[PDB]
Amino acid sequence: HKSEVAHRFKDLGEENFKALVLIAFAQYLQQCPFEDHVKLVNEVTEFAKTCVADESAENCDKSLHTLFGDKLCTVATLRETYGEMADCCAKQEPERNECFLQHKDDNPNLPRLVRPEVDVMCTAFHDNEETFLKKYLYEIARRHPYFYAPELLFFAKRYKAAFTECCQAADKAACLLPKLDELRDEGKASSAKQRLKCASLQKFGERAFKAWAVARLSQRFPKAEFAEVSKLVTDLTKVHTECCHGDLLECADDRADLAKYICENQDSISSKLKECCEKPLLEKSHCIAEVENDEMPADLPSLAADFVESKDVCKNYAEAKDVFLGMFLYEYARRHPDYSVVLLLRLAKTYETTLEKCCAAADPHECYAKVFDEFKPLVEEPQNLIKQNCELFEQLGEYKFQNALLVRYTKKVPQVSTPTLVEVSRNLGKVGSKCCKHPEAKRMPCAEDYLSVVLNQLCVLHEKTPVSDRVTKCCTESLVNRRPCFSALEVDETYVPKEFNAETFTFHADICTLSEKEEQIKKQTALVELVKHKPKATKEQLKAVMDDFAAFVEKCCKADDKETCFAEEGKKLVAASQAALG
Ligand SMILES: COc1ccc2c(c1)c(CC(=O)O)c(C)n2C(=O)c1ccc(Cl)cc1
Ligand SMILES: CCCC1C(=O)N2C(N(C)C)=Nc3ccc(C)cc3N2C1=O
Ligand SMILES: CCCCCCCCCCCCCC(=O)O
Ligand SMILES: CCCCCCCCCCCCCC(=O)O
Ligand SMILES: CCCCCCCCCCCCCC(=O)O
Ligand SMILES: CCCCCCCCCCCCCC(=O)O
């Protein structure tokens, strides 16, 4: 109302207010030490309390942007540490805020964060829960300047819960570790999806963004009217535009307004939004963004009715193309929660290409009469890959499934560096152990969101260190043709085998003491190298070599004088295997 800081403070609550202020500062002043931020927070919090006590106290009338910028310009070493950014302090609002946004470095040069020993973490956690948690909230935020603050807050709390539970455990490590690994992975995926989405908005434009959103929103909210979904797509697009620009405040408010709109009109949107709408102001957006799909209306007609058999098809389409196509998408998506979003777009594109040709023909109705037959092969392709790949993962385990993929992709793109192939294959492998668990009706949507991040990360690296035109093609292809393009890659006939290197296939006893994740990544690295040396080797030949090796290890690790063994048999294996592969 009269004082914005006061209002925010009352809504958020002291604890959340302080966490968010800390994050907001760490994202702009990525170089200042922890103690410096803690002091700014205390000062802002104290200031906020004065305003809560008296909305009319000095400066309490100033906007959050102005107050925020004034404090930022207080930093004494602003110029010495941030050089150019200091000049922003000479500008007036709103140029000042815009100037700050431009200097936020999406990827600073900070040391990697090393995970301490379980006991040290747990002890630090017990001795000062507050500074332990705020210390890492700081380290994470400064490293991910665009990570939406509230979401980061949500991760912190999941972190607190892991220590609280695990540090009291009998086997602290057995409890805590797997929790941290899951948190990290989920944290990495959330950050990558945010980056991906904003980058895509820049490349493909608003149209492609609206299409993706209509489809997505129709699956989750199948009972909502097309106009409401359109309303929602419109606002959602503004929201992502604002949020991508980087202004935390603008973004936060846009999201809040949308979640309230949605909660007020919930009975006309979805019946699954009950819980989400009762939760705290700070948790609404997040919750609704993850809400499960509502049940689709039981009495829904046939699409062929309004889109294939109708006589006004071309007349309606011409009158407002995107609207008509949007309607098609809406109708198709809410009937297919089991389809991935990208598949729905492929169907809409197909239907669009068809109407463009057909509506410019003598007898339209006859020209587009069998379009739904066009859809079949589009739908079946992804489905079959899912079946085939999940069956194979059922037989082999996560580890051996990862090796099968390793062989498969190394043969397809032999130019990619070995470490890159190992990482991508391992991740593809996890997508398999995470999605094949769901029933068929939920597999495709699952593979899509996970595969989208893996595929983009793969493309980012390669972009830096280009190595294959084919990968580059798939990487710069339409957002809808991406995964299909990679699926289409065929074995590389060109590739001339990498010459033999003794060292590369010589192993020592140190392999026996390595941890599981360590041994695997080591055997898997030799495997890629094996394939790059003998790309014409069949599955059979390769399978027999991996068996000798398998034995080789188990044998030498369970026998006196390891060193000699791995050096004596190393000769035999490498010699024998080389002969079996010619
Ligand atoms: C409901 O609104 C959207 C809009 C775009 C989305 C998503 C959700 C999700 C998440 C979800 O599937 O719900 C992902 C992964 N999007 C993209 O990758 C993407 C695609 C095209 C463009 Cl132009 C920009 C971004
Ligand atoms: C993944 C679910 C699709 C999806 C969804 O339901 N969303 C939603 N609402 C409330 C409809 N509001 C948003 C607010 C912020 C973000 C970052 C994303 C969404 N938005 C989506 O992207
Ligand atoms: C979001 C930060 C919450 C603070 C919880 C402390 C636990 C984080 C320690 C893990 C940092 C090492 C990075 C890693 O997991 O590899
Ligand atoms: C300088 C004090 C301002 C602190 C900035 C944080 C205020 C934003 C409120 C967040 C509201 C959550 C909205 C949502 O995403 O659901
Ligand atoms: C308000 C409705 C907006 C949606 C318009 C429907 C367009 C769907 C056609 C498929 C577009 C795929 C995007 C692309 O490849 O550029
Ligand atoms: C040309 C020398 C070939 C000998 C080296 C063989 C290395 C293959 C690695 C075996 C990986 C299989 C993994 C496993 O045993 O589970």
Curated annotation (Swiss-Prot):
It comes from the Eukaryota. Plasma. The modification N6-methyllysine is found at K532. The record marks K197 as: Aspirin-acetylated lysine. One of its GO terms (molecular function) is protein-folding chaperone binding. Ca(2+) 1 binds at E4, E242, D247, E250. The modification N6-succinyllysine is found at K203, K434, K517, K562. One of its GO terms (biological process) is cellular response to starvation. Changing E499K: In Manaus-1/Adana/Lambadi/Vancouver. Glycans are attached at residues 10, 49, 135, 160, 197, 223, 231, 274, 279, 311, 315-316, 321, 349, 376, 411, 437, 442, 492, 523, 532, 534, 543, 571. Disulfide bonds join C51-C60, C73-C89, C88-C99, C122-C167, C166-C175, C198-C244, C243-C251, C263-C277, C276-C287, C314-C359, C358-C367, C390-C436, C435-C446, C459-C475, C474-C485, C512-C557, C556-C565. Changing D363V: In Iowa city-1. (4Z,15Z)-bilirubin IXalpha binds at K238. The keyword Hydrolase does not apply. The record marks 2, 18, 39, 62, 71, 91, 104, 134, 157, 172, 179, 188, 193, 203, 210, 238, 260, 272, 284, 357, 370, 387, 400, 412, 430, 434, 464, 473, 498, 517, 522, 536, 539, 555, 558, 562, 572 as: Not glycated. GO terms for cellular component: blood microparticle; cytoplasm; endoplasmic reticulum; endoplasmic reticulum lumen; extracellular exosome; extracellular region; extracellular space; Golgi apparatus. Changing R112G: In Yanomama-2. Changing K534E: In Castel di Sangro. Residues 1-184, 185-377, 378-575 form the Albumin domain. The modification Phosphothreonine is found at T81, T418, T420. Changing K311N: In Canterbury/New Guinea/Tagliacozzo/Cuneo/Cooperstown. It holds the Pfam family Serum_albumin. PANTHER family: ALBUMIN, SERUM ALBUMIN-RELATED. Interacts with FCGRT; this interaction regulates ALB homeostasis. Interacts with TASOR. In plasma, occurs in a covalently-linked complex with chromophore-bound alpha-1-microglobulin with molar ratio 1:2 and 1:1; this interaction does not prevent fatty acid binding to ALB. This is Albumin. It comes from Homo sapiens. The gene is ALB.
